[PDB]
Each structure stands twice: as structure tokens, then as C-alpha cells.
Amino acid sequence: HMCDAFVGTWKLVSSENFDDYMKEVGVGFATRKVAGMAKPNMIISVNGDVITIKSESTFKNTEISFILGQEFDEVTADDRKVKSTITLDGGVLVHVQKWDGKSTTIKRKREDDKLVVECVMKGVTSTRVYERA
Template identity: 30%
Template sequence: MADKFDGKWQLHASENFEALMAKTGCPDESIRTAMKAVKDTTLEIFHEGDKWTFLNHTVFGARPAVFQIGVPTPTTTLDKRPLTATLTLEGDTLIRHATGDGFSVKHIRNVVNDEMILILICEDVVAYRRYHRVD
């Protein structure tokens, strides 16, 4: 079931993401820049066994992040703030727990047909992002 996440995904909808970015302490200028470029955001996901690679293409540039299932991994936010993230696969759901300086965000990914739904939770703020699969 993990194979359903593999591929290239185009962001097509985002709800409450601005509030989530603010909750994590993201600078206002970075939030404004990111919100203007929703349609220009793509994500490539591929895995081999327990090794997963996420390649984000955003206004902040292209950034790979590599995770081993269950292993805490140092990485950065898209605006380059340090954090530690742990990726798990629970049934049909891909979950990433990320903790940075003063914040923690849970990323919950599910694929339904050719749409990937990402739910992000930071304390009392919940954001949604929807991606279409592109070939």
C-alpha cells in the first residue's frame, strides 16, 4: 500500500496553511511568499523499502528530505529552520511528526484515487492541503 504515495504531486488546494505557518513561528515575509505560490508547489515522493525521499519544489527552491521509517531525522522547514522529523507508515496512512524550536507539527497523508490529502496539526491549528497526481 505504500506504493500509492510514490509519484509527482501538484498542490491544488490549501486551507488554513497560513495560520499553521504562523503558529510554527514562520516569518511573515516567508508566509506571504509561500501563500502566493500555491499553484507552483509540487512534491515528489518515492521509496525503496523503509527509505523514503520527499522532493519539494516550492518558491523557496527544490529541497530533498530523506527519511528511514521510525528513525528521527534532522531536517529543516521549507524556510530552512531546523527540526527533527520521524516518519511512520500506519496502514494506509503516512505520518510525519516534526518538532522544531517551540513547535511540533503532525503531517497525516492519505491517498484517495489520484488525490493526496495532507492534514497538518500544530496544537489547536489544523490545515489541509490537497494534491493531484501528475505524470
């Protein structure tokens, strides 16, 4: 029942500070503009020990599959090649991405009927709120 509170189909309803987060990450101007417009559908599923997160949007379609605690290689929507580890900490999915001696952490939590995504890169935080599709 791992991650049951997260499983389903979710749609972005609000974003704050995302352009600033993307700039801290190193995303270039054109990508930031187009990516910042996107309203993704996020699909989270669980099959045994394997979690799959898909993000579908007019910007990019991305999919990751992983086992908690077990590092994987991820190519991000903005084309970084990162090493990612996702863990469940106190009911929060914590996703750390490492590349070029940089790190960013994305946390996904359930709050009321929403799924709240917090993206942090050095001092800059963005909050993205999803509701059930």
C-alpha cells in the first residue's frame, strides 16, 4: 500500500516561483517560458516495489520508474542528465537530483485533497499544487 495516497491522476492547478526555480537550476530563457506555461497531468502508479511517475504536457512527456532508496539515472524535462534517489520520509516523497556537482530536491506531499510539490534549489523554493484529474 506503499504510496497509496499518491497513486492516481493529478492535474496542475497553480505554480509559484517556478521561473526563479528553473533559473537557479540553469534552465535557459526559451525553455523556461515554454515550460512555465505547461499544465501537466501527473500519473503516479505502484506495481509491487516499483513506483512510476509520468508527467504529460504540451511541453514534454516524461516517465520515471524507481524503487525507493535505489539510485537511478534520469533525463529531466529540461535535458539534464541527473542521478536521482527517491525516498519516503515521514509520508513525504523526497526526490534528490545530483548533476555537475549541483543538487536539487523535490518533495511531494499530500495536503487535504491536493498533492503539493515543493522544488528547492539553493535557497529558491517553488510550490506547485496538483488536484485530482
